[PDB]
PDB file of C-alpha atoms in Angstrom:
ATOM      1  CA  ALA A   1     -67.733 -26.296   2.440  1.00 13.05           C
ATOM      2  CA  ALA A   2     -66.255 -22.959   3.502  1.00 11.84           C
ATOM      3  CA  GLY A   3     -66.227 -22.120   7.202  1.00 10.85           C
ATOM      4  CA  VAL A   4     -66.837 -18.806   8.933  1.00 10.24           C
ATOM      5  CA  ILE A   5     -63.958 -16.292   9.071  1.00  7.24           C
ATOM      6  CA  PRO A   6     -61.030 -17.668  11.117  1.00  8.11           C
ATOM      7  CA  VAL A   7     -59.441 -16.048  14.118  1.00  5.99           C
ATOM      8  CA  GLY A   8     -56.537 -14.945  11.865  1.00  7.49           C
ATOM      9  CA  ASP A   9     -58.800 -12.779   9.685  1.00 10.48           C
ATOM     10  CA  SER A  10     -57.707  -9.139   9.992  1.00 12.50           C
ATOM     11  CA  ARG A  11     -61.139  -8.172  11.340  1.00 12.45           C
ATOM     12  CA  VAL A  12     -60.921 -10.657  14.197  1.00 10.72           C
ATOM     13  CA  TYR A  13     -57.562 -11.208  15.981  1.00  9.43           C
ATOM     14  CA  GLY A  14     -56.224  -8.012  17.535  1.00  9.47           C
ATOM     15  CA  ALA A  15     -59.379  -6.129  16.574  1.00  8.77           C
ATOM     16  CA  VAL A  16     -62.487  -7.626  18.187  1.00  9.72           C
ATOM     17  CA  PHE A  17     -60.789 -10.673  19.733  1.00  9.60           C
ATOM     18  CA  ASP A  18     -57.664 -10.713  21.966  1.00  9.69           C
ATOM     19  CA  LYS A  19     -57.235  -6.977  21.588  1.00 10.36           C
ATOM     20  CA  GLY A  20     -53.924  -7.059  23.474  1.00 12.65           C
ATOM     21  CA  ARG A  21     -52.537 -10.003  21.483  1.00 12.55           C
ATOM     22  CA  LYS A  22     -51.801 -12.136  24.570  1.00 13.04           C
ATOM     23  CA  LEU A  23     -51.797 -15.286  22.416  1.00  9.71           C
ATOM     24  CA  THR A  24     -50.580 -15.563  18.813  1.00  9.69           C
ATOM     25  CA  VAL A  25     -52.852 -16.422  15.868  1.00  8.79           C
ATOM     26  CA  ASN A  26     -51.487 -19.964  15.701  1.00 11.59           C
ATOM     27  CA  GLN A  27     -52.085 -20.396  19.441  1.00  9.30           C
ATOM     28  CA  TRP A  28     -55.718 -19.312  18.942  1.00 10.28           C
ATOM     29  CA  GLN A  29     -56.063 -21.673  15.969  1.00 10.03           C
ATOM     30  CA  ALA A  30     -54.950 -24.529  18.209  1.00 10.84           C
ATOM     31  CA  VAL A  31     -57.013 -23.528  21.269  1.00 13.16           C
ATOM     32  CA  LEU A  32     -60.288 -22.861  19.443  1.00 15.26           C
ATOM     33  CA  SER A  33     -59.869 -26.091  17.442  1.00 13.98           C
ATOM     34  CA  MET A  34     -59.259 -28.062  20.615  1.00 13.12           C
ATOM     35  CA  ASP A  35     -62.280 -26.533  22.361  1.00 12.37           C
ATOM     36  CA  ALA A  36     -64.539 -27.406  19.438  1.00 13.67           C
ATOM     37  CA  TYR A  37     -63.865 -31.126  19.737  1.00 13.84           C
ATOM     38  CA  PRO A  38     -65.701 -31.969  22.999  1.00 16.57           C
ATOM     39  CA  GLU A  39     -68.443 -29.574  21.987  1.00 15.12           C
ATOM     40  CA  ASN A  40     -68.983 -30.454  18.311  1.00 12.09           C
ATOM     41  CA  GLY A  41     -67.075 -33.678  17.620  1.00 12.30           C
ATOM     42  CA  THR A  42     -64.551 -32.024  15.303  1.00 10.59           C
ATOM     43  CA  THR A  43     -61.568 -29.695  15.619  1.00 11.36           C
ATOM     44  CA  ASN A  44     -62.938 -27.662  12.693  1.00 11.71           C
ATOM     45  CA  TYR A  45     -64.105 -24.770  14.871  1.00 13.03           C
ATOM     46  CA  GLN A  46     -65.067 -22.692  11.805  1.00 14.52           C
ATOM     47  CA  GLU A  47     -67.793 -25.104  10.593  1.00 13.52           C
ATOM     48  CA  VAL A  48     -70.868 -22.994   9.799  1.00 12.36           C
ATOM     49  CA  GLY A  49     -73.324 -25.224  11.645  1.00 12.72           C
ATOM     50  CA  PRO A  50     -72.508 -24.323  15.252  1.00 11.75           C
ATOM     51  CA  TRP A  51     -72.220 -20.615  14.339  1.00 11.99           C
ATOM     52  CA  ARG A  52     -75.708 -20.414  12.781  1.00 15.07           C
ATOM     53  CA  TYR A  53     -77.097 -22.781  15.449  1.00 11.99           C
ATOM     54  CA  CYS A  54     -80.069 -21.519  17.419  1.00 11.01           C
ATOM     55  CA  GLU A  55     -82.342 -23.792  19.392  1.00 10.67           C
ATOM     56  CA  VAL A  56     -85.519 -23.080  21.339  1.00 12.24           C
ATOM     57  CA  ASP A  57     -85.310 -24.559  24.866  1.00 15.54           C
ATOM     58  CA  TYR A  58     -82.531 -27.083  24.223  1.00 15.81           C
ATOM     59  CA  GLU A  59     -82.822 -28.026  27.894  1.00 17.21           C
ATOM     60  CA  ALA A  60     -86.452 -29.167  27.599  1.00 20.41           C
ATOM     61  CA  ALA A  61     -85.682 -31.145  24.444  1.00 20.70           C
ATOM     62  CA  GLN A  62     -83.050 -33.075  26.409  1.00 18.38           C
ATOM     63  CA  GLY A  63     -85.021 -33.509  29.640  1.00 17.00           C
ATOM     64  CA  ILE A  64     -82.931 -30.985  31.574  1.00 17.16           C
ATOM     65  CA  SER A  65     -84.910 -29.063  34.201  1.00 14.84           C
ATOM     66  CA  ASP A  66     -83.048 -25.730  34.033  1.00 15.89           C
ATOM     67  CA  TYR A  67     -84.659 -23.129  31.774  1.00 15.29           C
ATOM     68  CA  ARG A  68     -82.310 -21.039  29.646  1.00 16.10           C
ATOM     69  CA  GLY A  69     -84.523 -19.849  26.782  1.00 19.14           C
ATOM     70  CA  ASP A  70     -82.852 -19.976  23.373  1.00 22.12           C
ATOM     71  CA  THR A  71     -79.308 -21.282  23.008  1.00 22.76           C
ATOM     72  CA  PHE A  72     -77.231 -20.083  20.067  1.00 21.30           C
ATOM     73  CA  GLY A  73     -73.851 -19.699  18.388  1.00 23.13           C
ATOM     74  CA  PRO A  74     -70.511 -21.482  18.883  1.00 25.68           C
ATOM     75  CA  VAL A  75     -70.416 -21.009  22.666  1.00 25.98           C
ATOM     76  CA  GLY A  76     -74.128 -21.369  23.397  1.00 25.94           C
ATOM     77  CA  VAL A  77     -75.195 -17.900  24.488  1.00 24.79           C
ATOM     78  CA  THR A  78     -78.520 -18.299  26.286  1.00 23.94           C
ATOM     79  CA  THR A  79     -81.337 -15.774  26.381  1.00 23.97           C
ATOM     80  CA  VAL A  80     -81.661 -16.370  30.120  1.00 22.71           C
ATOM     81  CA  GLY A  81     -78.009 -15.941  31.024  1.00 21.68           C
ATOM     82  CA  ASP A  82     -75.328 -14.168  29.019  1.00 20.87           C
ATOM     83  CA  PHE A  83     -77.591 -12.815  26.249  1.00 19.77           C
ATOM     84  CA  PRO A  84     -77.914  -9.289  27.675  1.00 17.61           C
ATOM     85  CA  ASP A  85     -74.124  -8.884  27.640  1.00 14.85           C
ATOM     86  CA  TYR A  86     -73.982 -10.486  24.187  1.00 11.76           C
ATOM     87  CA  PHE A  87     -76.661  -8.104  22.932  1.00 14.23           C
ATOM     88  CA  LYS A  88     -75.397  -4.878  24.484  1.00 13.01           C
ATOM     89  CA  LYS A  89     -71.665  -5.349  23.918  1.00 14.07           C
ATOM     90  CA  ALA A  90     -71.511  -7.451  20.745  1.00 13.25           C
ATOM     91  CA  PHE A  91     -74.683  -7.906  18.683  1.00 14.15           C
ATOM     92  CA  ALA A  92     -75.862  -4.288  18.890  1.00 14.46           C
ATOM     93  CA  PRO A  93     -72.542  -2.669  17.969  1.00 13.52           C
ATOM     94  CA  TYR A  94     -71.352  -5.148  15.315  1.00 14.31           C
ATOM     95  CA  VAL A  95     -74.646  -6.196  13.691  1.00 12.31           C
ATOM     96  CA  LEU A  96     -77.063  -3.347  14.452  1.00 14.71           C
ATOM     97  CA  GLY A  97     -74.481  -0.559  14.376  1.00 13.60           C
ATOM     98  CA  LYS A  98     -75.722   0.597  17.770  1.00 14.74           C
ATOM     99  CA  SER A  99     -73.535   2.163  20.476  1.00 15.92           C
ATOM    100  CA  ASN A 100     -74.495   2.547  24.143  1.00 15.66           C
ATOM    101  CA  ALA A 101     -77.025  -0.262  23.797  1.00 19.69           C
ATOM    102  CA  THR A 102     -78.999  -0.590  27.031  1.00 19.00           C
ATOM    103  CA  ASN A 103     -81.522  -3.024  28.480  1.00 21.58           C
ATOM    104  CA  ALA A 104     -84.231  -0.723  27.115  1.00 21.87           C
ATOM    105  CA  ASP A 105     -82.781  -1.149  23.613  1.00 20.68           C
ATOM    106  CA  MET A 106     -82.728  -4.915  24.122  1.00 20.97           C
ATOM    107  CA  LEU A 107     -86.384  -4.851  25.178  1.00 21.22           C
ATOM    108  CA  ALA A 108     -87.279  -2.782  22.111  1.00 24.25           C
ATOM    109  CA  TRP A 109     -85.467  -5.278  19.863  1.00 23.95           C
ATOM    110  CA  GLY A 110     -87.300  -8.187  21.480  1.00 25.17           C
ATOM    111  CA  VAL A 111     -90.627  -6.407  20.929  1.00 25.45           C
ATOM    112  CA  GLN A 112     -89.654  -5.651  17.297  1.00 27.66           C
ATOM    113  CA  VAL A 113     -88.791  -9.201  16.331  1.00 27.91           C
ATOM    114  CA  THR A 114     -91.458 -11.115  18.298  1.00 29.68           C
ATOM    115  CA  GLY A 115     -94.462  -8.782  18.167  1.00 28.65           C
ATOM    116  CA  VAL A 116     -94.946  -9.465  21.882  1.00 32.98           C
ATOM    117  CA  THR A 117     -95.725  -6.344  23.966  1.00 31.57           C
ATOM    118  CA  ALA A 118     -93.009  -4.782  26.145  1.00 31.16           C
ATOM    119  CA  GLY A 119     -94.893  -5.559  29.360  1.00 35.03           C
ATOM    120  CA  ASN A 120     -94.778  -9.277  28.607  1.00 39.40           C
ATOM    121  CA  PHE A 121     -90.978  -9.438  28.616  1.00 39.79           C
ATOM    122  CA  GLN A 122     -88.457  -9.768  31.327  1.00 38.27           C
ATOM    123  CA  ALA A 123     -85.639  -7.554  30.070  1.00 39.52           C
ATOM    124  CA  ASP A 124     -82.776  -6.970  32.489  1.00 38.14           C
ATOM    125  CA  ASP A 125     -79.127  -7.847  33.110  1.00 40.14           C
ATOM    126  CA  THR A 126     -80.063 -11.514  33.646  1.00 42.03           C
ATOM    127  CA  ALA A 127     -82.414 -12.249  30.720  1.00 43.45           C
ATOM    128  CA  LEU A 128     -84.469 -11.293  27.737  1.00 42.04           C
ATOM    129  CA  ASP A 129     -87.471 -13.607  28.056  1.00 38.91           C
ATOM    130  CA  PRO A 130     -90.957 -13.382  26.521  1.00 39.73           C
ATOM    131  CA  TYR A 131     -93.822 -14.433  28.827  1.00 38.15           C
ATOM    132  CA  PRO A 132     -91.653 -15.303  31.863  1.00 38.84           C
ATOM    133  CA  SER A 133     -94.665 -16.604  33.851  1.00 37.49           C
ATOM    134  CA  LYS A 134     -96.045 -18.878  31.119  1.00 37.17           C
ATOM    135  CA  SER A 135     -95.241 -22.579  30.927  1.00 34.08           C
ATOM    136  CA  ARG A 136     -92.045 -23.166  28.953  1.00 32.62           C
ATOM    137  CA  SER A 137     -94.056 -25.240  26.462  1.00 29.71           C
ATOM    138  CA  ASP A 138     -96.791 -22.598  26.039  1.00 26.10           C
ATOM    139  CA  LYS A 139     -97.565 -22.128  22.326  1.00 30.17           C
ATOM    140  CA  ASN A 140     -97.189 -18.351  22.373  1.00 29.34           C
ATOM    141  CA  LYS A 141     -94.040 -18.452  24.481  1.00 27.62           C
ATOM    142  CA  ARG A 142     -92.449 -20.974  22.111  1.00 29.04           C
ATOM    143  CA  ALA A 143     -93.560 -18.874  19.135  1.00 30.99           C
ATOM    144  CA  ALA A 144     -91.779 -15.796  20.504  1.00 30.56           C
ATOM    145  CA  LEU A 145     -88.604 -17.741  21.321  1.00 30.64           C
ATOM    146  CA  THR A 146     -88.736 -19.081  17.773  1.00 32.16           C
ATOM    147  CA  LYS A 147     -88.906 -15.516  16.388  1.00 33.52           C
ATOM    148  CA  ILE A 148     -85.847 -14.560  18.450  1.00 32.18           C
ATOM    149  CA  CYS A 149     -83.964 -17.514  16.945  1.00 32.29           C
ATOM    150  CA  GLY A 150     -85.217 -16.434  13.516  1.00 35.99           C
ATOM    151  CA  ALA A 151     -83.860 -12.907  14.014  1.00 36.59           C
ATOM    152  CA  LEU A 152     -80.436 -14.154  15.072  1.00 34.96           C
ATOM    153  CA  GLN A 153     -80.261 -16.561  12.132  1.00 39.96           C
ATOM    154  CA  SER A 154     -81.396 -13.746   9.824  1.00 38.40           C
ATOM    155  CA  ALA A 155     -78.330 -11.860  11.065  1.00 42.00           C
ATOM    156  CA  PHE A 156     -76.132 -14.855  10.191  1.00 39.61           C
ATOM    157  CA  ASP A 157     -77.717 -15.066   6.733  1.00 38.27           C
ATOM    158  CA  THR A 158     -77.638 -11.359   5.827  1.00 37.12           C
ATOM    159  CA  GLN A 159     -74.438 -10.289   7.571  1.00 37.93           C
ATOM    160  CA  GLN A 160     -72.401 -13.433   8.194  1.00 36.03           C
ATOM    161  CA  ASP A 161     -69.085 -11.702   8.863  1.00 36.79           C
ATOM    162  CA  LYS A 162     -70.532  -9.099  11.278  1.00 34.77           C
ATOM    163  CA  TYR A 163     -72.563 -11.756  13.071  1.00 34.16           C
ATOM    164  CA  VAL A 164     -69.545 -14.040  13.364  1.00 34.41           C
ATOM    165  CA  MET A 165     -67.559 -11.032  14.635  1.00 35.11           C
ATOM    166  CA  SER A 166     -70.237 -10.430  17.300  1.00 31.68           C
ATOM    167  CA  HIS A 167     -69.696 -13.947  18.602  1.00 30.40           C
ATOM    168  CA  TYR A 168     -65.913 -13.562  18.554  1.00 31.08           C
ATOM    169  CA  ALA A 169     -66.394 -10.289  20.471  1.00 34.32           C
ATOM    170  CA  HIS A 170     -68.585 -12.003  23.058  1.00 33.09           C
ATOM    171  CA  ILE A 171     -66.069 -14.811  23.445  1.00 31.73           C
ATOM    172  CA  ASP A 172     -63.442 -12.087  23.967  1.00 30.57           C
ATOM    173  CA  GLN A 173     -65.400 -10.153  26.592  1.00 30.82           C
ATOM    174  CA  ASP A 174     -67.200 -13.005  28.377  1.00 30.40           C
ATOM    175  CA  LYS A 175     -64.523 -15.708  28.228  1.00 26.73           C
ATOM    176  CA  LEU A 176     -61.057 -14.357  27.380  1.00 27.70           C
ATOM    177  CA  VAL A 177     -61.030 -11.244  29.560  1.00 28.55           C
ATOM    178  CA  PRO A 178     -62.084 -13.085  32.760  1.00 27.49           C
ATOM    179  CA  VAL A 179     -59.465 -15.763  31.964  1.00 28.43           C
ATOM    180  CA  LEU A 180     -56.734 -13.132  31.561  1.00 30.22           C
ATOM    181  CA  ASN A 181     -57.764 -11.279  34.729  1.00 31.54           C
ATOM    182  CA  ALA A 182     -57.894 -14.513  36.751  1.00 30.54           C
ATOM    183  CA  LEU A 183     -54.519 -15.727  35.501  1.00 33.81           C
ATOM    184  CA  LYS A 184     -52.969 -12.330  36.236  1.00 32.75           C
ATOM    185  CA  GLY A 185     -54.308 -12.560  39.788  1.00 32.32           C
ATOM    186  CA  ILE A 186     -52.269 -15.717  40.403  1.00 34.14           C
ATOM    187  CA  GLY A 187     -49.098 -14.526  38.678  1.00 33.95           C
ATOM    188  CA  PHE A 188     -49.350 -15.514  35.004  1.00 34.88           C
ATOM    189  CA  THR A 189     -49.265 -12.753  32.370  1.00 33.99           C
ATOM    190  CA  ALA A 190     -47.127 -14.065  29.498  1.00 35.94           C
ATOM    191  CA  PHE A 191     -48.236 -16.940  27.277  1.00 37.44           C
ATOM    192  CA  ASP A 192     -45.791 -17.315  24.387  1.00 37.71           C
ATOM    193  CA  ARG A 193     -43.903 -20.190  26.065  1.00 39.37           C
ATOM    194  CA  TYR A 194     -46.351 -21.538  28.668  1.00 42.34           C
ATOM    195  CA  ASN A 195     -49.845 -21.125  27.268  1.00 40.06           C
ATOM    196  CA  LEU A 196     -52.030 -21.512  30.351  1.00 41.41           C
ATOM    197  CA  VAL A 197     -54.807 -19.586  28.612  1.00 42.44           C
ATOM    198  CA  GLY A 198     -55.297 -22.740  26.536  1.00 43.94           C
ATOM    199  CA  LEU A 199     -56.274 -24.736  29.617  1.00 43.10           C
ATOM    200  CA  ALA A 200     -58.172 -21.986  31.401  1.00 41.58           C
ATOM    201  CA  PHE A 201     -60.143 -21.054  28.281  1.00 43.09           C
ATOM    202  CA  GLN A 202     -61.942 -24.401  28.082  1.00 40.81           C
ATOM    203  CA  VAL A 203     -62.721 -24.221  31.803  1.00 39.90           C
ATOM    204  CA  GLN A 204     -64.183 -20.741  31.411  1.00 34.56           C
ATOM    205  CA  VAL A 205     -66.328 -21.703  28.400  1.00 31.96           C
ATOM    206  CA  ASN A 206     -67.690 -24.776  30.229  1.00 30.90           C
ATOM    207  CA  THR A 207     -68.049 -23.446  33.797  1.00 32.35           C
ATOM    208  CA  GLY A 208     -68.095 -19.639  33.549  1.00 32.75           C
ATOM    209  CA  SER A 209     -66.238 -19.746  36.856  1.00 31.37           C
ATOM    210  CA  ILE A 210     -62.541 -19.203  36.025  1.00 32.10           C
ATOM    211  CA  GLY A 211     -62.275 -16.582  38.780  1.00 31.52           C
ATOM    212  CA  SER A 212     -62.213 -19.583  41.128  1.00 31.18           C
ATOM    213  CA  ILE A 213     -58.582 -20.270  40.159  1.00 28.90           C
ATOM    214  CA  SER A 214     -57.586 -17.729  42.841  1.00 29.56           C
ATOM    215  CA  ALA A 215     -57.367 -20.795  45.102  1.00 28.46           C
ATOM    216  CA  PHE A 216     -54.039 -21.672  43.433  1.00 32.57           C
ATOM    217  CA  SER A 217     -52.319 -18.828  45.326  1.00 35.11           C
ATOM    218  CA  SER A 218     -52.787 -20.728  48.603  1.00 36.84           C
ATOM    219  CA  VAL A 219     -51.680 -23.972  46.968  1.00 36.98           C
ATOM    220  CA  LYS A 220     -48.456 -22.377  45.741  1.00 38.28           C
ATOM    221  CA  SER A 221     -47.780 -20.596  49.042  1.00 38.21           C
ATOM    222  CA  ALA A 222     -48.311 -23.865  50.923  1.00 39.03           C
ATOM    223  CA  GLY A 223     -45.503 -25.406  48.862  1.00 39.30           C
ATOM    224  CA  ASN A 224     -47.725 -27.982  47.141  1.00 39.08           C
ATOM    225  CA  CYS A 225     -45.815 -27.690  43.857  1.00 43.64           C
ATOM    226  CA  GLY A 226     -42.477 -28.970  45.126  1.00 44.35           C
ATOM    227  CA  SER A 227     -40.130 -29.337  42.161  1.00 46.83           C
ATOM    228  CA  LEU A 228     -42.840 -28.614  39.579  1.00 43.97           C
ATOM    229  CA  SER A 229     -42.570 -25.235  37.851  1.00 44.45           C
ATOM    230  CA  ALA A 230     -45.296 -22.708  38.686  1.00 40.70           C
ATOM    231  CA  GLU A 231     -46.763 -23.201  35.214  1.00 44.57           C
ATOM    232  CA  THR A 232     -46.701 -27.003  35.193  1.00 46.98           C
ATOM    233  CA  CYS A 233     -48.031 -27.028  38.740  1.00 49.60           C
ATOM    234  CA  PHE A 234     -50.949 -24.790  37.804  1.00 49.47           C
ATOM    235  CA  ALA A 235     -51.689 -26.760  34.619  1.00 49.40           C
ATOM    236  CA  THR A 236     -51.924 -29.910  36.712  1.00 46.40           C
ATOM    237  CA  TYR A 237     -53.884 -28.265  39.532  1.00 42.41           C
ATOM    238  CA  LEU A 238     -56.440 -26.764  37.156  1.00 43.80           C
ATOM    239  CA  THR A 239     -56.837 -30.084  35.329  1.00 44.54           C
ATOM    240  CA  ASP A 240     -57.390 -31.996  38.595  1.00 46.12           C
ATOM    241  CA  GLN A 241     -59.913 -29.408  39.770  1.00 47.43           C
ATOM    242  CA  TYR A 242     -61.758 -29.411  36.422  1.00 48.00           C
ATOM    243  CA  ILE A 243     -61.946 -33.229  36.457  1.00 50.17           C
ATOM    244  CA  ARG A 244     -63.304 -33.018  40.013  1.00 48.22           C
ATOM    245  CA  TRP A 245     -65.942 -30.570  38.769  1.00 51.89           C
ATOM    246  CA  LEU A 246     -66.892 -32.714  35.746  1.00 50.62           C
ATOM    247  CA  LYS A 247     -67.086 -36.023  37.633  1.00 49.63           C
ATOM    248  CA  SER A 248     -69.165 -34.802  40.589  1.00 48.94           C
ATOM    249  CA  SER A 249     -72.963 -35.094  40.631  1.00 48.74           C
ATOM    250  CA  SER A 250     -72.787 -32.138  43.032  1.00 47.42           C
ATOM    251  CA  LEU A 251     -70.783 -29.909  40.672  1.00 43.47           C
ATOM    252  CA  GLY A 252     -70.610 -30.078  36.873  1.00 42.62           C
ATOM    253  CA  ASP A 253     -72.264 -33.517  36.758  1.00 43.34           C
ATOM    254  CA  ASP A 254     -70.880 -34.350  33.323  1.00 45.06           C
ATOM    255  CA  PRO A 255     -68.800 -37.483  34.031  1.00 44.43           C
ATOM    256  CA  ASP A 256     -68.958 -38.811  30.451  1.00 45.16           C
ATOM    257  CA  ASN A 257     -67.028 -35.693  29.394  1.00 45.26           C
ATOM    258  CA  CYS A 258     -64.390 -35.643  32.124  1.00 46.59           C
ATOM    259  CA  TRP A 259     -61.774 -36.669  29.521  1.00 51.45           C
ATOM    260  CA  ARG A 260     -61.915 -33.164  28.013  1.00 49.87           C
ATOM    261  CA  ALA A 261     -59.835 -31.938  30.948  1.00 50.30           C
ATOM    262  CA  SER A 262     -57.188 -34.626  30.415  1.00 51.42           C
ATOM    263  CA  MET A 263     -57.132 -33.913  26.672  1.00 49.18           C
ATOM    264  CA  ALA A 264     -56.096 -30.330  27.279  1.00 49.73           C
ATOM    265  CA  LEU A 265     -53.384 -31.271  29.788  1.00 51.24           C
ATOM    266  CA  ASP A 266     -52.027 -33.917  27.389  1.00 52.42           C
ATOM    267  CA  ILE A 267     -51.754 -31.269  24.683  1.00 52.93           C
ATOM    268  CA  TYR A 268     -49.970 -28.849  27.046  1.00 52.15           C
ATOM    269  CA  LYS A 269     -47.506 -31.603  27.972  1.00 51.16           C
ATOM    270  CA  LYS A 270     -46.684 -32.297  24.315  1.00 51.41           C
ATOM    271  CA  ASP A 271     -46.547 -28.606  23.450  1.00 52.88           C
ATOM    272  CA  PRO A 272     -46.692 -26.063  26.279  1.00 55.37           C
ATOM    273  CA  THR A 273     -47.118 -23.270  23.720  1.00 53.68           C
ATOM    274  CA  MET A 274     -50.394 -24.938  22.675  1.00 55.27           C
ATOM    275  CA  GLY A 275     -49.696 -23.345  19.314  1.00 54.04           C
ATOM    276  CA  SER A 276     -50.173 -26.231  16.891  1.00 56.83           C
ATOM    277  CA  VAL A 277     -53.544 -27.496  15.684  1.00 54.68           C
ATOM    278  CA  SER A 278     -51.577 -30.502  14.408  1.00 53.38           C
ATOM    279  CA  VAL A 279     -50.626 -31.507  17.954  1.00 54.39           C
ATOM    280  CA  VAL A 280     -54.274 -31.030  18.986  1.00 54.51           C
ATOM    281  CA  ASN A 281     -55.400 -33.470  16.287  1.00 54.72           C
ATOM    282  CA  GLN A 282     -52.614 -35.929  17.116  1.00 55.02           C
ATOM    283  CA  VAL A 283     -53.550 -36.088  20.807  1.00 56.61           C
ATOM    284  CA  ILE A 284     -57.264 -36.422  20.059  1.00 54.39           C
ATOM    285  CA  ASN A 285     -56.798 -39.233  17.537  1.00 60.36           C
ATOM    286  CA  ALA A 286     -54.389 -41.143  19.795  1.00 59.76           C
ATOM    287  CA  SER A 287     -56.189 -40.928  23.133  1.00 57.31           C
ATOM    288  CA  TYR A 288     -59.645 -39.410  22.725  1.00 57.59           C
ATOM    289  CA  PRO A 289     -61.363 -40.796  19.617  1.00 60.18           C
ATOM    290  CA  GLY A 290     -65.156 -40.909  19.458  1.00 56.85           C
ATOM    291  CA  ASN A 291     -65.463 -38.125  22.029  1.00 55.00           C
ATOM    292  CA  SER A 292     -64.449 -40.267  24.980  1.00 53.27           C
ATOM    293  CA  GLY A 293     -61.429 -41.333  26.984  1.00 52.79           C
ATOM    294  CA  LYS A 294     -60.179 -41.599  30.536  1.00 54.97           C
ATOM    295  CA  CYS A 295     -59.732 -38.735  32.984  1.00 55.57           C
ATOM    296  CA  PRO A 296     -56.967 -39.713  35.422  1.00 57.07           C
ATOM    297  CA  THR A 297     -56.035 -37.117  38.050  1.00 55.57           C
ATOM    298  CA  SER A 298     -52.484 -36.522  39.249  1.00 58.00           C
ATOM    299  CA  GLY A 299     -52.956 -37.764  42.794  1.00 57.96           C
ATOM    300  CA  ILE A 300     -51.148 -34.660  44.064  1.00 57.68           C
ATOM    301  CA  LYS A 301     -52.310 -33.486  47.477  1.00 54.83           C
ATOM    302  CA  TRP A 302     -53.663 -29.953  47.133  1.00 52.34           C
ATOM    303  CA  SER A 303     -54.181 -27.842  50.259  1.00 52.05           C
ATOM    304  CA  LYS A 304     -57.168 -26.030  48.781  1.00 48.45           C
ATOM    305  CA  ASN A 305     -59.785 -26.977  46.206  1.00 46.33           C
ATOM    306  CA  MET A 306     -61.505 -24.539  43.905  1.00 44.91           C
ATOM    307  CA  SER A 307     -64.899 -23.274  45.014  1.00 43.65           C
ATOM    308  CA  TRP A 308     -67.097 -23.085  41.926  1.00 43.44           C
ATOM    309  CA  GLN A 309     -69.531 -20.272  41.008  1.00 42.00           C
TER     310      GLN A 309
END
């Protein structure tokens, strides 16, 4: 079937997503397709399923202790977490036509769509959550979270393009901008030849901690790169650090997915522009079929590791 609007749609690239055109459209096609694979099992990032997706307490369903409320959309916005930023800077302007959306407006929306009274919400920069003191499996709490999912899916159904644009806008503001700022801080600003955004983007989507790459400045100053170019050195450093994060029970604790770091580096090595979805598919089919693979690190001695969060 047809997917949601692609990054190359005139309403998306250059408009609500990558407003400064740091990457090209074909680079975004490759990067978003690559990112979709570890997450969804396909490089078809436009598939409608993950964009309409909204689940009540995914964590509880999977026996994870952390509580995040509802999880929704292609990058899993959570109602305890990044939802307030998603609501105020993306959903309200693009779907609701509302400027200067505040936490009070978010509270009012929550009240509107759940029928739960304002006093029974937490509504601040960290969360919109109905009945924050009730058990997560409480019938009325689950009912309200279900209504929030219903409202978001109603937005997908009635205004698919605007809703999709709101998620592109959130990806832009919550993922791309921090990636660009962090990379600039360590000396990388141009991505037409050496597309380091491609590697950093996946790390930011998974960890939300791309600011931690500031540690590379010390690594470079210490001379750890030797004959490696600054770009190749960073690509390798970031990949090693990301693997470290994924493998460790004390960090990301997702060892079965550590290969996703090596996938991205393998793609960069075949095509440093990371501007071909064909190369993405080729690497995945050769070395990472069935959402698995090995995650070898470089062995390079780094003088400083990244400190996460």
